[PDB]
Amino acid sequence: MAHFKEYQVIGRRLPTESVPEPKLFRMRIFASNEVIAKSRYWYFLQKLHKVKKASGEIVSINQINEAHPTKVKNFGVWVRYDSRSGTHNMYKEIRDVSRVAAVETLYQDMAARHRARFRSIHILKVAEIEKTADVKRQYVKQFLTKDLKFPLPHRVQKSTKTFSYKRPSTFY
Amino acid sequence: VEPVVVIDGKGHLVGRLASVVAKQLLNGQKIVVVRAEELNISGEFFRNKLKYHDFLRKATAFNKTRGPFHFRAPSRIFYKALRGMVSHKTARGKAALERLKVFEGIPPPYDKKKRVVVPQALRVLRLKPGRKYTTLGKLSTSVGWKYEDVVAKLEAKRKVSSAEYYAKKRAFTKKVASANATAAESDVAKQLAALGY
Amino acid sequence: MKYIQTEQQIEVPEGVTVSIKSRIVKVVGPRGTLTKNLKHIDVTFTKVNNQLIKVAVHNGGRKHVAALRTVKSLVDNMITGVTKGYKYKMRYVYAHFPINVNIVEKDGAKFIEVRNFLGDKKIRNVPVRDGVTIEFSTNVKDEIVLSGNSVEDVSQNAADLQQICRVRNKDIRKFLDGIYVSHKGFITEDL
Amino acid sequence: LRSLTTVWAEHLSDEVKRRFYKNWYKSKKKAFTKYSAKYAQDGAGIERELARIKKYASVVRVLVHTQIRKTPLAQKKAHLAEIQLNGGSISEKVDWAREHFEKTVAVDSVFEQNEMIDAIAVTKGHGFEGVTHRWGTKKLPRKTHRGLRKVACIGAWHPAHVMWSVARAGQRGYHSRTSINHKIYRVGKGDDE
Amino acid sequence: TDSIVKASNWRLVEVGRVVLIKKGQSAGKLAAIVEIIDQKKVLIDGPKAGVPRQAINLGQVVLTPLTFALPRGARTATVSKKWAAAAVCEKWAASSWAKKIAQRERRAALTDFERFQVMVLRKQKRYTVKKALAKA
RNA sequence: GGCCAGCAUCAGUUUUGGUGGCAGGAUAAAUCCAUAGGAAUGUAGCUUGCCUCGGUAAGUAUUAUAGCCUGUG
RNA sequence: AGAACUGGCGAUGCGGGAUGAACCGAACGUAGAGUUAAGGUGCCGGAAUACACGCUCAUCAGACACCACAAAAGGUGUUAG
RNA sequence: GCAGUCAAGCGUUCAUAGCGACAUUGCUUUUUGAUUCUUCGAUGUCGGCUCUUCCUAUCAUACCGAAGCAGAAUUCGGUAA
RNA sequence: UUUGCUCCACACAAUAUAGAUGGAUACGAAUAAGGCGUCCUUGUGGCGUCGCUGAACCAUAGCAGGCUAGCAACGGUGCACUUGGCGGAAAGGCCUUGGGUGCUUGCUGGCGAAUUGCAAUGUCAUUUUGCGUGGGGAUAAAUCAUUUGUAUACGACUUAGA
């Protein structure tokens, strides 16, 4: 849906004389701007409580910045996604430096493997995998081995003119 | 850049060579292509064999002469890929097509001239290593091109003389690098260094 | 899911020095010398010590990794084939007509000549491949034996003969006539 | 294949020379008169062309001509043709050809008895021929208006063009044919009663 | 008869592999691979060169054949202390690669005058060298 | 002053750069420094077992002859 | 084949969908500069053989609405659950 | 009209050698219908003769795999126009 | 048929032009590997080094590049010659020898340049043709008609004719 930000979004249930100060629910929402995030907030609240944006109020909207944006983290992810023939929960694992970077390639993955456009996916939970060997998925586990190294064989250099006088070398 | 550009066909993907060759002539750049028999098509030999036979059955039912013409030579397989990328029924297109020559092997004058390469058509640069591909000379001799052996014969001879040539040349630029070494450390040399040379 | 590194060992024995530049492989042991062209397979060989070599695939897919072992194995059979050697044993079967097998020559040749198969007037001739010798085995009845350095050259010259002898137009259960591969083994003994 | 030279004999019969002219009786018969001068000087360029053949030349053919005065025919114009030499060694082929300039070759050096040979020749011509005899087409019935040696249907409605396969009245004969496997029962001699 | 198997020796993605950024705000600055995110992304730090700590796609950077001991996941200061201790810069400075980069950076700055001087000099160098080429 | 240009200073419309001063937010989040705790893809040391005279391995071992992580300031 | 509400075509060119009454975009005095729409930017052909993460190898692969068709049922092909 | 899928049954025993109910998914445009778009200031009806060319859902011929293929014969299938 | 044809030389005249404006600057082969240098045990060898783009290399100063002097070099390059050799895939071009001769910005000098007026491509390329001149060289055929019938509707074919 774009390059993502994360948003604390807080809203409540409009006041009534008989019930002033209603109950205040928060959600974290991944959106590309604050207008989507508020629409998205109201999308889920109508899926849980009896409210709709008309009868309710957004109390506050705040961006959440990654706590340690230069530290590599292993993320487990929890997703509910409609498919053509029916809806299914999932758990994937994503290794990256920010929750926002994580959510970005999640949505990219759900589109490439499962053909799921943004409207189908629900983010259920994203949380930092704390101890390793709570990493459960082999494509991440590959990258946790001690003293890891790999070559990048068959290197391809982008040419800047239509002709070359040499002959390329994929050496590296 | 240069009046004529000679392209070693060897190692290039047909549709991506044709694609750039086409645009160059339309911009007025003369081109000659050599060694079209060492040209490559993506996909295994059998696919492009069938693909050629699909092409091969199209003909004018009432007279097979007016119908589509099927040229078997690797150069002409290439010139067909090219012509489809040029509006060849305009005068402007016939113009551009005339700035083109395609050759099996490297005949005279072009043999002693230098030939260049097109990195965005280079097979080794584009295909994922592990895809299967085709060589134009194999495919053409399959569909009736008569001359693969004579070309390969002449080439391997031409290839041997050009090694004599090169050997001498690497032996002359051995001296040139030697005389260039004495000149190093002199005033001329040290000043040129500072100026980037 | 793109396996970043997976490898395989190629062990080397006392009489054998294998030499690989580009992906062309040469193996020279006691029994001879063999060469096989791996250029098509996209793998990295590494010498370690003179008795050991590794073959690896970096960032491979299934099909790519799946071709790692078959590279290891393919060089092994060059190693054993150059030390021990390869011997394929075949033994004729016929229920009436005595299949009659000789070695024949025209123009340097060396053909295997099968006569009277199921009574055929026809003469079948399988050519002897190079580096493979056929010796009819004394002491056992209706046995041919193909020996050589190259598994693939013998096992093929093996199945070449077995397939000249296929049967047509009859039930091929009830008609078992043929020449079949009865044993596959090495040349040098105790093993 | 491309021919890169033709070396000719020095002397050339009037039989072959007649073949190089449409009108002989009027002409100055100047054919090959500057070529014969190439033999004069020491042999010179005649050697270099002969030499170039040996160096190059994947193939050697020999120009021969019939002796048509030795024949009952009225036409004096001889018949010149190329005949590939199949005997060994390109350098030996031109050597043989050089040795035979102006000299004669006889049939018994080509064909022995019982040999399977092929005949290349131009069929007797009949000129313009109806579709019936020319293609072996069924005669149409007798009641048919507008004539019965024809083809009823020149084609279906579509493709709406008469087609290359359909039989049509045209020339018949005077075709080139290569007919094979003709055994030689006798090789005669002219000096033989 | 030894065995004799090739090498095919590649520069490697690894902690402490120093890497030349190509596109972006940094672009020509060296930097070191700190941690390693996956087959494509990596975590780099450039502190002496000025480049910020960041995740970066590997195809945006080229591997130098230069290496030094760095703890995986080492923070920026640590990166800086180890980088200076290893003399990375003067090592890279001394390489033909960086000398070639510096060379063409000079050629680009040449004043038209200097251009006319490079010519006059090459004329003189040519005179004595083409001479030296006939004397042996 | 007939036609046509060139440049300069302006006017209307517009396109494409360089650059200066400020306001927000977790009064960004980080790095950086201070500090408290911590673990392992366990750094030094130590033990042990083979092992071409020290290198390996599997044990201890939480800063030591690398460092990282988390909170608070 | 026959109704409902609106919008069109008919009566209407212009950009796009190669082509096309009705779709998308947008409705027309004569022109200049700029910006766009729908749709596009390998070459035909104006415009990135742009950047990024995956997926796919088809001995009849696939390739964008209206639209120029494909189903049950299967696969120890491969991918992710 | 031709072709599948499930597999209850048939086939001495035995679901699938060869078949196949109840169901059910499709393909085809030499059937017949339905429609009424083109042609009513006219596109010459049926069949045959003649001749060409194309399709394949192959009757024969080539090479094959199945069989409730001993042989002989036949049946099912594949590559095949 | 009114002194024609051809190759080389220059001249005036025309007519062109799918688009000159320092140089198309020669290994091969691999790419999960190579180029180069060096060494040897001549190898699928040892050792060194390089790439990460031709952003290079070569050329480049002088009236569009004039007129002149000198030095140091003995090098470079242009031209016409001459020695020997190679190239047939469309070779029609490449190399080598030896004299001659021009230039040399390798370095140091003398003189010239203006008024084309503050820009106006400011004309420097190569196509074909025609017309005289004189330096070499060469002195045919085809068609109509007539004729054959191995041919033919007419043309065409195939013969024959000092």
Ligand SMILES: [Mg+2]
């Ligand atoms: Mg059978």
Ligand SMILES: [Mg+2]
């Ligand atoms: Mg039978």
Ligand SMILES: [Mg+2]
């Ligand atoms: Mg000649």
Ligand SMILES: [Mg+2]
């Ligand atoms: Mg008649």
Ligand SMILES: [Mg+2]
């Ligand atoms: Mg007849």
Ligand SMILES: [Mg+2]
């Ligand atoms: Mg009648």
Ligand SMILES: [Mg+2]
């Ligand atoms: Mg008829």
Ligand SMILES: [Mg+2]
């Ligand atoms: Mg203005």
Ligand SMILES: [Mg+2]
């Ligand atoms: Mg509408």
Ligand SMILES: [Mg+2]
């Ligand atoms: Mg009306």
Ligand SMILES: [Mg+2]
């Ligand atoms: Mg209207």
Ligand SMILES: [Mg+2]
């Ligand atoms: Mg309209």
Ligand SMILES: [Mg+2]
């Ligand atoms: Mg369409």
Ligand SMILES: [Mg+2]
């Ligand atoms: Mg339209």
Ligand SMILES: [Mg+2]
């Ligand atoms: Mg709409």
Ligand SMILES: [Mg+2]
């Ligand atoms: Mg086109």
